[PDB]
């Protein structure tokens, strides 16, 4: 319409995540309005309103991720866990959030850090504006 | 006005899975008012230019990789491995499309889409921001 | 201007019946979602997206069900039958064209209805208007 805010970014880094680390999705497929930062992996709200956030992550073992929301200090909205013994999986999560300007949203690793990002088994993080405030 | 929007949800209603390394046809429509998804070719074609969301959820009881294609280029791949029990393979992406661009899903050598009773396969796409 | 958008999660759900109640509201713009019943009520007629990511450890089959004039309209299902006692996330979603008063909810298979209950991880139900009709 007018306020066109949408991002989709894949992860291509094969370096193991540590607990509490921000999960970076370094390769942008889409980033309209450039409110997503591929250097950190965080989205930062410019225009207040309703957003939908979603991810799909490939993994070869146990994976838990925290969906984080906040300004300079972030709080976890939810934790998604999907386990896999010795087998490849793709898991997913989504969330509708009403965000204020300055609020950031990003995914954060736990203990459970088995996540792949590569050709043939991607991991992706997306979000878009539903309705402006 | 209906023709200034774009939305579909199609499903795969058949017990036989796709052929290896082929485009995945969804033959049944839940909604497709603009006809942007074509059940005879298996392809979405862009009528209204702008930003789209595409997402799918595919049931399988053997190995399955789903590839999403845009105008001949593979955008994303997601794979799920299982043996005789049922899981859902999911994937999705936002894309800014021009009129006439085609979007579709395909499989590779891991092609199973045979869900147990009560587990189906769906592919959705909708226009968020027109230009 | 029409905004209807919700996300709800499970934490202290009333149990009973095959309707999956997500008792904890994260977002409820226009308050379309009823957290005591697990039912979304359409106020603005139009095309809506609905999706769920639900955690199980055993067997689970879920369906997004709707109703018009109180008549139930069954739809597609989605299952995880890994049945090994480890976190698996079953997911599904669809566009639904709704009329005013139409209700939308998640229902489980009475024979396959294990939904994780606890604080390690979350199950989510979300929905939003795509465009009014
Ligand atoms: C368990 C239940 O359904 N009731 C809760 C109630 O405790 C809470 O005060 C209210 C506020 O949103 O949300 C309801 O869902
Ligand atoms: Ca799993």
Report yes or no: C73 and C121 within 8 Å, Cβ to Cβ: no
d(CA B9, CA A119): 27
Q: Cβ neighbours of residue A116 under 8 Å, at least 6 residues apart?
A: A14, A57, A58, A59, A60, A88, A123
**Pocket, ligand 1, Cβ cutoff 6 A:** C 12, 14, 23, 25, 35-36
CB contact under 8 A, C61 and B119: yes
Q: Compute the distance between CA of residue C39 and CA of residue C65 in angstroms, rounded to an integer.
A: 10
Task: Give the DSSP per-residue string, A4-17.
Answer: --EEEEE----SPP
CATH code for position A78? 2.60.120.40
Please name every residue paired with C9 in a beta bridge, in sequence order, or none if there are none.
Answer: C24, C124
- Is B121 in a helix, a strand, or coil? coil
CA C36 to ligand 1: nearest atom: 3
**Using CB atoms, which residue from B87, B92, B129 is nearest to A126?**
B92
Query: What CATH code is carried by the domain that includes residue B109?
Result: 2.60.120.40
Looking only at the bridges linking them, the beta strands covering A42-44 and B37-38 are: unpaired
Phi/psi region, residue C36 (left: phi>0; alpha: psi -120 to 50; beta: rest), is alpha
Concatenate the DSSP letters of all residues of C37-88 into one string: TTEEE--S-EEEEEEEEEEESS-EEEEEEEEETTEEE---EEEE---SSS-E
Task: Give A34's DSSP letter.
Answer: S
Measure B33 CA to nearest chain A CA, in Å: 21
- Nearest alpha carbon to residue C35 among C53, C20, C50: C20
* Three-state secondary structure string covering C89-108: EEEEEEEEEECCCCEEEEEE
**Does B126 contact C95 at a Cβ distance shorter than 8 Å?**
yes
CATH 2.60.120.40 fits C1-133, yes or no: yes
Best to test chain C binding among A64, A77, A82, A92 (most C CBs inside 10 Å): A82
Q: How many CB atoms lie within 10 A of CB B73?
A: 7
3-class secondary-structure state, position B77: strand
Ligand nearest to the CA of C22: 1
Cα Dmax for chain C: 48
Taking the alpha carbons at both ends of chain B, their separation in whole angstroms is 15
B129: nearest CA partner in chain A? A1
Task: Report yes or no: C58 and C83 within 8 Å, Cβ to Cβ.
Answer: yes
Tell me, yes or no, if C83 comes closer than 8 A to chain B by beta carbon: yes
Overall number of domains in chain A: 1
Query: How many other C-beta atoms lie within 10 A of the C-beta of residue B54?
Result: 24
Listed residue (C33, C30, C55) closest to C132, CA to CA: C30
C16 CA → ligand 1 middle, Å: 16
* Range of the structural domain that residue A37 is part of: 1-133
| Domain membership of residue B73 as a residue range | 1-131
Question: Residue A53 in contact with residue A126, Cβ under 8 Å?
Answer: yes
Query: Which residues in chain A are closer than 8 Å to B65, comparing Cβ atoms?
Result: 120
State both tokens at C30. Answer: 């226009």
Q: Is B19 touching A (CB cutoff 8 A)?
A: no
How would you class A40 by CB atoms within 10 Å of its CB: exposed for 0-12, middle for 13-18, buried for 19 or more? middle
* Number of domains forming the structure of chain B: 1
Cβ partners under 8 Å of residue A115, min gap 6? A11, A17, A23, A57, A58, A59, A63, A109, A123
Domain definitions of chain C by residue range:
1-133
Contact yes or no for B52/B92 (Cβ under 8 A): no
């Amino acid at each position: 319409a007018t306020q066109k805010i949408a991002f989709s970014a894949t992860r291509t880094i094969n370096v193991p995540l540590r607990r509490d680390q921000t999960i970076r999705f370094d390769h942008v497929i889409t980033n309209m309005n450039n409110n997503y930062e591929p250097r950190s992996g965080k989205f930062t709200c410019k225009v207040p309103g309703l957003y939908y956030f979603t991810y799909h992550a490939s993994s070869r073992g146990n994976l838990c991720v925290n969906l984080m929301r906040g300004r300079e200090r972030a709080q976890k909205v939810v934790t998604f866990c999907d386990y896999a013994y010795n087998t490849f999986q793709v898991t997913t999560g989504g969330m509708v959030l009403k965000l204020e300007q300055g609020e950031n949203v990003f995914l954060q690793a736990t203990d459970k850090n088995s996540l792949l990002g590569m050709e043939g088994a991607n991991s992706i993080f997306s979000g878009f504006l539903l309705f402006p405030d | 006005k209906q023709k200034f929007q774009s939305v579909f949800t199609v499903t795969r209603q058949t017990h036989q899975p796709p052929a290896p390394n082929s485009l995945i046809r969804f033959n049944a429509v839940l909604t497709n008012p603009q006809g942007d998804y074509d059940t005879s070719t298996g392809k979405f074609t862009c009528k209204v230019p702008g930003l789209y969301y595409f997402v799918y959820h595919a049931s399988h009881t053997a190995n399955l990789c789903v590839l999403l294609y845009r105008s001949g280029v593979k955008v994303v791949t997601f794979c799920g491995h299982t043996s005789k029990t049922n899981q859902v393979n999911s994937g999705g992406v936002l894309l800014r499309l021009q009129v006439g661009e085609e979007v579709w899903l395909a499989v590779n050598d891991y092609y199973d889409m045979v869900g147990i009773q009560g587990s189906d396969s769906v592919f959705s796409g909708f226009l968020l921001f027109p230009d | 201007q029409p905004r209807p958008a919700f996300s709800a999660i499970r934490r202290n759900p009333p149990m009973g019946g095959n309707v999956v109640i997500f008792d904890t509201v994260i977002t409820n713009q226009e308050e379309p979602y009823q957290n005591h019943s697990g039912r979304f009520v359409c106020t603005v007629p139009g095309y809506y997206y609905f999706t769920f990511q639900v955690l199980s450890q055993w067997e689970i089959c879920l369906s997004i069900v709707s109703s018009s004039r109180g008549q139930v309209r069954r739809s597609l299902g989605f299952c995880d039958t890994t049945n090994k006692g480890l976190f698996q996330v079953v997911s599904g979603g669809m566009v639904l064209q709704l009329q005013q008063g139409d209700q939308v909810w998640v229902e489980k298979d009475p024979k396959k209805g294990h939904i994780y209950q606890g604080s390690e991880a979350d199950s989510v139900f979300s929905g939003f208007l795509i465009f009014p009709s």
